[PDB]
Amino acid sequence: ERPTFYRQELNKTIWEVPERYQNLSPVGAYGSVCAAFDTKTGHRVAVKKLSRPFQSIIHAKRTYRELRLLKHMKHENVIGLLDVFTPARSLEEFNDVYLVTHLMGADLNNIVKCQKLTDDHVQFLIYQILRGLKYIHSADIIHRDLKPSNLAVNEDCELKILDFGLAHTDDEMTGYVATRWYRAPEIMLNWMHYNQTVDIWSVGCIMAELLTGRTLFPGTDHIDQLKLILRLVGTPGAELLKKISSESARNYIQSLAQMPKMNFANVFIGANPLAVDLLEKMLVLDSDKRITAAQALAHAYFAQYHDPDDEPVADPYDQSFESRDLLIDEWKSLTYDEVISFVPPP
Numbered sequence: 434e435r436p437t438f439y440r441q442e443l444n445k446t447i448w449e450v451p452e453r454y455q456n457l458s459p460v461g462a463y464g465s466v467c468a469a470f471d472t473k474t475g476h477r478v479a480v481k482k483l484s485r486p487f488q489s490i491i492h493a494k495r496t497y498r499e500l501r502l503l504k505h506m507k508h509e510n511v512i513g514l515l516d517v518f519t520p521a522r523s524l525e526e527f528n529d530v531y532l533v534t535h536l537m538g539a540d541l542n543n544i545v546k547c548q549k550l551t552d553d554h555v556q557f558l559i560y561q562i563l564r565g566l567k568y569i570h571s572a573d574i575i576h577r578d579l580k581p582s583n584l585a586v587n588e589d590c591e592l593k594i595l596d597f598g599l600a601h602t603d604d605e606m607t608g609y610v611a612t613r614w615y616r617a618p619e620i621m622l623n624w625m626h627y628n629q630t631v632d633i634w635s636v637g638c639i640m641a642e643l644l645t646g647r648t649l650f651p652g653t654d655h656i657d658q659l660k661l662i663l664r665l666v667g668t669p670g671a672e673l674l675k676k677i678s679s680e681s682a683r684n685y686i687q688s689l690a691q692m693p694k695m696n697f698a699n700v701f702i703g704a705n706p707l708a709v710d711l712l713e714k715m716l717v718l719d720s721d722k723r724i725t726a727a728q729a730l731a732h733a734y735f736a737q738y739h740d741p742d743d744e745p746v747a748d749p750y751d752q753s754f755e756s757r758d759l760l761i762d763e764w765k766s767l768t769y770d771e772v773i774s775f776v777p778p779p
């Protein structure tokens with residue numbers, strides 16, 4: 434049952450992996466990554482060795498969360514898990530976890546670097562993001578970190594979502610940084626309990642950038658970015674103000690002079706009118722009123738790609754562990770069980 438493993442030191446790290454994985458070559462604070470050839474499947478793969486997976490309760494729970502999420506995702510537009518392994522022969526000697534995925538090449542940044550695309554390409558790329566999001570959201574999973582560097586794209590314009598948000602620090606979100614430019618305002622400023630609607634805001638920011646070739650809200654800090662957002666979509670009325678928990682945040686918003694929603698046809702000059710209409714439905718300040726992924730797939734902008742018989746939902750996903758309090762060794766045992774029960778895809 435257990436494959437034979439072989440050891441080797443590559444760039445200060447000891448790697449112990451099954452013989453099927455050959456010609457390892459380093460490529461990249463959560464772990465180290467090597468490219469390899471998988472002789473069992475013929476795929477070029479990424480092998481990630483997790484760093485200190487069980488060093489604290491918070492870190493042990495995060496390791497379990499990542500493995501549970503990756504084992505669930507089975508969709509053409511979402512990254513999936515090809516393999517997971519440990520060299521340990523028992524729970525008592527279990528310390529290291531390795532994750533194997535398809536090796537990804539270019540991301541959406543490269544396809545879009547200072548450059549804008551034709552309308553048919555925008556339709557196909559955004560269609561695939563929304564198809565993957567319908568699947569993710571149907572399992573009550575929120576990505577939280579959608580942005581161009583987290584979207585893999587090949588030469589045939591085919592797209593996969595990767596790098597789910599596993600719960601980024603304060604410093605990573607400070608200043609003139611792409612890590613914040615795609616985030617919905619309610620999460621950027623901690624206005625309220627957020628939900629899956631945050632991902633639709635991010636899609637609107639991505640779609641705008643594909644149409645213009647430029648970042649939509651390139652703020653120099655949180656407040657500068659909020660000002661750019663409210664200039665486009667308008668300042669909020671009392672209905673949304675009542676939904677913001679912090680009195681300080683409400684006071685700050687009301688200190689700003691009121692502004693109307695702008696004409697999106699005069700911002701996205703020359704865009705397909707159906708693209709303008711869809712952007713107006715995604716980039717809505719009140720998250721309760723944003724279009725959902727399932728609704729957006731039926732919008733006329735996607736008429737040439739929409740097939741309601743080929744837009745699947747996910748199997749139900751059990752997240753009850755998120756509210757559970759366990760010790761390090763208990764999270765470690767749960768992770769071990771998930772490693773040993775893995776069944777590879779066809």
Ligand SMILES: Cc1ccc(N2C(=O)C=CC2=O)cc1C#N
Pocket residue numbers: 549644645646647700701702703704
């Ligand atoms: C400022 C701006 C507005 C609109 C656009 N644009 C096109 O050129 C085609 C669709 C669209 O929105 C680009 C820029 C740029 N750069």
Ligand SMILES: [Cl-]
Pocket residue numbers: 436437451452453454
């Ligand atoms: Cl092997």
Ligand SMILES: [Cl-]
Pocket residue numbers: 511512513514535
């Ligand atoms: Cl995949």
Ligand SMILES: [Cl-]
Pocket residue numbers: 519520521526527528529530
């Ligand atoms: Cl181990």
Ligand SMILES: [Cl-]
Pocket residue numbers: 542580581582583611
């Ligand atoms: Cl990015």
Ligand SMILES: [Mg+2]
Pocket residue numbers: 582583596
């Ligand atoms: Mg990433």
